[PDB]
Amino acid sequence: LQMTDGMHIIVEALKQNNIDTIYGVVGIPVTDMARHAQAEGIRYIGFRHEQSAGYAAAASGFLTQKPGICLTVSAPGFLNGLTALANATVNGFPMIMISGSSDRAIVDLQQGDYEELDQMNAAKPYAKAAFRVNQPQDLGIALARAIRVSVSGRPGGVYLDLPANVLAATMEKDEALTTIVKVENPSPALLPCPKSVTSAISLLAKAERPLIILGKGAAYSQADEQLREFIESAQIPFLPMSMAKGILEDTHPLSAAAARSFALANADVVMLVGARLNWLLAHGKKGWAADTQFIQLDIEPQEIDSNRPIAVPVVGDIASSMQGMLAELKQNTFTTPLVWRDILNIHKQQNAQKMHEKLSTDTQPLNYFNALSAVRDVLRENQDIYLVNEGANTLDNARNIIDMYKPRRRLDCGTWGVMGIGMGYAIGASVTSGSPVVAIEGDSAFGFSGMEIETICRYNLPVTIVIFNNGGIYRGDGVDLSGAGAPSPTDLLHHARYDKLMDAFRGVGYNVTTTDELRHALTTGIQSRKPTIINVVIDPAAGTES
Amino acid sequence: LQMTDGMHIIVEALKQNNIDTIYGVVGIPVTDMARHAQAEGIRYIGFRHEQSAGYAAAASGFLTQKPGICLTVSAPGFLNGLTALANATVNGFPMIMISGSSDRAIVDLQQGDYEELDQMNAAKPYAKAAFRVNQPQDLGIALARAIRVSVSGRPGGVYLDLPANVLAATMEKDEALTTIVKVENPSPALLPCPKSVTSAISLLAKAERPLIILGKGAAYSQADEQLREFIESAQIPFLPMSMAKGILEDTHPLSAAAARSFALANADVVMLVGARLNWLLAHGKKGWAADTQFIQLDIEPQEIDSNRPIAVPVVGDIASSMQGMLAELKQNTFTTPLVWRDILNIHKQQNAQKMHEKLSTDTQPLNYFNALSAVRDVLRENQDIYLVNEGANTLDNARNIIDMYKPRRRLDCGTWGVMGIGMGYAIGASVTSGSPVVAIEGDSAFGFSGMEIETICRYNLPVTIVIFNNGGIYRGDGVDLSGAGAPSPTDLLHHARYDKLMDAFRGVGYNVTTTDELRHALTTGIQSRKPTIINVVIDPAAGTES
Amino acid sequence: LQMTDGMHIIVEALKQNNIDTIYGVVGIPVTDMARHAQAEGIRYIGFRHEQSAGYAAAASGFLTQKPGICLTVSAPGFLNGLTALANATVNGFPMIMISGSSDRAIVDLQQGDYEELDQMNAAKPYAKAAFRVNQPQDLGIALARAIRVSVSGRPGGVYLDLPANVLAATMEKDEALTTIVKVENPSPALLPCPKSVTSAISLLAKAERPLIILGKGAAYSQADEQLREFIESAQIPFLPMSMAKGILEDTHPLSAAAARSFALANADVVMLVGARLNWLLAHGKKGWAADTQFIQLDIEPQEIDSNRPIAVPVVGDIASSMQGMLAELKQNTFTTPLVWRDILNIHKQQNAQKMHEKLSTDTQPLNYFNALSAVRDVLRENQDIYLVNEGANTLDNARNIIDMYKPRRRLDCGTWGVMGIGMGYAIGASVTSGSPVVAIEGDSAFGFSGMEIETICRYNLPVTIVIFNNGGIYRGDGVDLSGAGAPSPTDLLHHARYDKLMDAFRGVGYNVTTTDELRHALTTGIQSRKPTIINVVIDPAAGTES
Ligand SMILES: Cc1ncc(C[n+]2csc(CCOP(=O)(O)OP(=O)(O)O)c2C)c(N)n1
Ligand SMILES: Cc1ncc(C[n+]2csc(CCOP(=O)(O)OP(=O)(O)O)c2C)c(N)n1
Ligand SMILES: Cc1ncc(C[n+]2csc(CCOP(=O)(O)OP(=O)(O)O)c2C)c(N)n1
Ligand SMILES: [Mg+2]
Ligand SMILES: [Mg+2]
Ligand SMILES: [Mg+2]
């Protein structure tokens, strides 16, 4: 009579569901679970802080449509991971945070258990669902629920709570195997109303000035070929939002990225593809035509009419809706007016000339534009990389300047504009893909997760961290207004040498003050596949404060 | 007609209430508030992550009984600070986290505002109270509430939400000044039932084997002289809990710290002073006498009978209760039986001899005992320092070995056993006191807040960080059980040189492999008052795993 | 320039969205809103308690797919309505509860406002969404969101909070009109993956013992003709769950209702149509074959694998799914094994014979069977009624014995087994339909909403309330086990005459003790269309417990 326990059961359930990586920080009561998972051939990546583990998991979910798995301990570790779970739900990235919890009887009486918290209830506001498993025979179905919840609808974080007692709880091994559930097709296709599709095509065909906006839902869908075919067939100008850059290459002739304001102000019919009318699009209000008509492809009927009335909702999974839209277009072809494309190009060209001046003009110290021009030159020759990016000036300028050539290669601060995603996203992207990562980091941004450089060294991951060191938050030229000479609230240490941090962990560091030095250091870093920090000296006065 | 705005009003309210320090991370919508606070002579300390800002604030509250102030931005920064606010409430440390929030109208409709979150409601589970201020004329009374709530009863975290619009909202300056509220005596004395006090003394006087346990409520109360007088008058053996070490010096002849198990198993009457029967005391169950009778001094009547029935509750603020207890003892003196003290001393001596062997026996590599013996030798000569401590082996062994000579000088992982409090507590303690800090840090523990070494350098704070580098969580000799040769879930990088991190920020680093080297490096670090990291090479096999 | 205010704007928005009835209880700050809605041609129905108003709104939603509107005041009224909102969400019935709230500034500071509560946050755990409107120009979009959310996915309750200030807030009339949103097609069709449809048909065609279960979702969908055609085409036995009775008439040859236990114990393939594997189906565990394979038609992907692994999820709206299932069956026809249908029929006849004996045997006093047989005699002759039903014995027996002939005519205690839905569901059904209602009520059940008989009288609604008066909860023969002779916890007043309650409100009352009296009284009630109570004297010892 062979016995097993809850810990072995949950590991087997993860294995059967093709989980091959767990991102976490161990401790009571989950250390043995991690060790056993690794024994069973799951890759374990241990972090310096759970929030970076959670960011890594969500990145892996965005890239793959399989929920990333984040493992934490009870209360103190759980709360750190929860901050990341919250971010995944806001952004629409599938992940499951699995946390140990303490003694249900003691916690339910608030008697002061070890790491006491009702973690299930704590996670509820920040997750698509929060489940807690009390019986080992329910672990398999619980994981099945968590997987389906995380990837169905608009994807997001799910919390799965494993009390210490369920991990230790025993059952007969043969019976235990019958309770494990392998989920086939956890996010089934949901097809739109055919009438919606016909109405959408008809409205586009009548448009004088149609515009498609590709949002991160579009990128997540992996409908890359359908989106490109639709756009090129009808020659419809498009605006890629940050993490949608690269679905079509950013150099594509139909991209209106360089005339964004003109496009939003003048488009008459706008087709949102997995793009919400939230603050990133000014809620469809400021800067938009008074009477824009919207077509909206979104999986969530609850998102329709959230901000502006939507003329033609196309509710369904984006891949299925794009298949329908393409089929309807084939039967009822149209071509966007050439005049609209031509006038867009006038505006794009005006801005391109202004950008080109900034990119190509040398300054000492460096500014954002000439530094990022050097980065742009290198990355153009290394189109296999993933790009992670966070900061304020460092974020907005890199978003504009660094062209993405392939889809789902850009990961950034996202909908909540979180500083602290940089190292976790780099680790998640590198582990998931096996590809090199370049992280373009504000100096303040980097400080939120910088201890993870040891994690990067520990697993010898090919991450090149390029820190835009302007000596502060937005700018480094702040002054203490009291006259006391203290650092201002936005100042960081003058001339910190972040490259030297790598010396602690046997990584590589470069300090750079010119575009030639930056180009060399970045090329060498990427080619070397060694963990590398490049400290870029940026003019403290170059940035603007939002 | 001179006008002012909400931002100026809240700064003036903080000033009038003797807030002289704010710990935070700025960004929209609070940067100008921080700059203006600093203009007005409030010291601003900016962190690399809000959780360390929040830990600093709570430390300052524990040391002073004045709530520490933590300032954050909206959603992403707020959530990071919230993790620390939660910790303050659990531990009983007064603090106020002030966060900017976004547009109430947009957030209430869930339309996707910039940094959208109902932060007030989010903070409610983790705070004594959560307030949100919509009108500038209510800022003064709101701050008054927050101060009184944070320090009254059992102290804890309070959340104060300032929507961006209230900061910008204007009012006439003279009228505005009339709405500012200076709180006098925000935590008034609450005196116990005199019958409780008489019953407590009577029970102690009948005890064969009485024991006092001093908890962090005792330390917080600053009733140092009354506690010492009571203990010495009746010669009552006492057990200091971690953050109560030093109320009486740890070398005091009545301390039963070195016979803890014997004391708990054999005491007949136990007087808890600001000490909960939670997991840290095994809930008064395992390891206790079957029929212990409890006296409990606590400010919270809701804590009485939480775990074991309490024979004599003494409900009131600990300082007031100790004044009553001392007065009642003076009228009805007794002396603890000498036999009980003598048999305690037998057991203390048995353990002292075992400890002394471990402390004084050289090993290569170093172990926890001989390394901490070197630390003990230095700290005995530097009794003006604050000691911050976190880890597992690093925590438990330092707690046992490093004697505290003065009260409220030890700050550690606390009731939730949080890793990540080390740098924030060191910064809070240093800024508050103007004294040197020694942080004795596990290598895993340090990784949770290690980027704050730049903060320490930026403000040139006299913090010596001693990292017990055993190469992992508990131990550094883990193995990948799959045979693939990957780092085990508990391993960190082999032979990381954390001392080299200081090179980035112009701090000082020492690497040490012997007790002589450690003693020298630690003495020099403390005397120098320079930001310093000491990397201590500890045997990877020395630690135990809980 | 002509002005308007929030109150006028929201009424106009309700009108434009074809809201023609509001169910409510007035008071500050919503009385004028109700007066004006009524002025504008909306039918106002005022209740004696908000819980019944909310039940009425949810009933109307179930019957129509248009959310019922419940209107309440702030805290005390809001909380009463919330209990009903919670029930709507659990059951999947669309409704919007609109509540006034107090002063956001005062409530956010917890200063003790008039009827102070954060109502939006209070409603969140019980609603699909909770929205709060601060600006009158956002009232139209807020209502548009509330409508869409309430009827999409699995339908449910939405809370819409209107602070007193928004109702009073003014704007220019013409501009205000441009902010009103008329929602077209609030729940668009969502079609299932074609492969899942083909898989479902394939599995059914291979089944030896297939069974369809029709749940409330099937009833709500209004796919009556598609369901009938599918069932009849393949001759698939079906089980109607309570509120799905009548989709096909309960006397249909293929109904397995009279062999329910045998059918669940023996089916090999079970097709759930808008039916959860919750407690009502014993979670697919107790009473089921060990290896049942499930097809599940549900709109909510989060419901799949909640309890038992589901072999063939068919995710999409039920009407759309059934259209696809029907089309696929046509291309791939099959006939359910005759042997299976025959065996079911053997079991059905045996239970029908046992039923007939209980039904046809007269007793004094009446029992549940002969009383309900009398009721069925009358309802057989009066088929255009609505049936409301609640109780324990009164519920289970009426569910079994009263055949439904048409869909969406039965309303009962539902998924949470709530006592107190009877009067509200009766009012909602009669107001919505214009048809007579028969409410078959346990005497305890009736007590939960009994004051609403005045409401029934006030609006002269054709409701006949048939109270099964057995003198208590389950039974009326309880004894005080102390010997003191007090009523037992399940006893109600011996021989209460509920019919006399109607005297207070000029309604009609009958007391009945025999089947003949019962038949006459019920026939007269229905045909008179007068508010009527029939007090039915039931044997206190007839019922069973639990
Ligand atoms: C967790 C978190 N805390 C605070 C903020 C506020 N914030 C916005 S940008 C920013 C950093 C800006 O400085 P940096 O990253 O150095 O970029 P720069 O503009 O200097 O290039 C911060 C802290 C945030 N977005 N997230
Ligand atoms: C925020 C948080 N995450 C995880 C844990 C679990 N945990 C307990 S001790 C510990 C670290 C132990 O290693 P270390 O600090 O290096 O001390 P050592 O025992 O090796 O001396 C961790 C991560 C925790 N307590 N808090
Ligand atoms: C709001 C609410 N309170 C309590 C219950 C528990 N409960 C179940 S059935 C029932 C009443 C049973 O008696 P009755 O309605 O008279 O029917 P009978 O069995 O006597 O025919 C009650 C109170 C409930 N379901 N809902
Ligand atoms: Mg910067
Ligand atoms: Mg360690
Ligand atoms: Mg009854």
Swiss-Prot record, chains A, B, C:
EC category name: lyase
Annotated binding of ADP, by residue: 154, 216, 276, 298, 318
Listed Gene3D superfamilies: 3.40.50.970, TPP-binding domain
A GO biological process held by the record: fatty acid alpha-oxidation
Membrane spanning stretches: none
Notes on how activity is controlled: Activated by ADP.
Reactions accelerated catalytically: oxalyl-CoA + H(+) = formyl-CoA + CO2
pH effects: Optimum pH is between 5.5 and 7.
Induction record: By the acid response regulator EvgA.
Keywords tagged on the record: Decarboxylase, Lyase, Magnesium, Metal-binding, Nucleotide-binding, Thiamine pyrophosphate
Note describing how the cofactor binds: Binds 1 Mg(2+) ion per subunit. Binds 1 thiamine pyrophosphate per subunit.
Cofactor(s) essential for the protein: Mg(2+); thiamine diphosphate
Residue sites binding Mg(2+) per the record: 443, 470, 472
List of residues binding substrate: 28, 114, 257-261, 351, 399-400
Positions annotated to bind thiamine diphosphate: 368, 392-394, 417-419, 444-445, 474
Top-rank taxon: Bacteria
Protein's job: Involved in the catabolism of oxalate and in the adapatation to low pH via the induction of the oxalate-dependent acid tolerance response (ATR). Catalyzes the decarboxylation of oxalyl-CoA to yield carbon dioxide and formyl-CoA.
The family this protein is said to belong to: Belongs to the TPP enzyme family.
Subunit structure: Homotetramer; dimer of dimers.
NCBIfam families: oxalate_oxc, PRK09259.1
Protein name: Oxalyl-CoA decarboxylase
Organism in which the protein naturally occurs: Escherichia coli (strain K12)
The organism's taxonomic lineage, starting at the top: Bacteria, Pseudomonadati, Pseudomonadota, Gammaproteobacteria, Enterobacterales
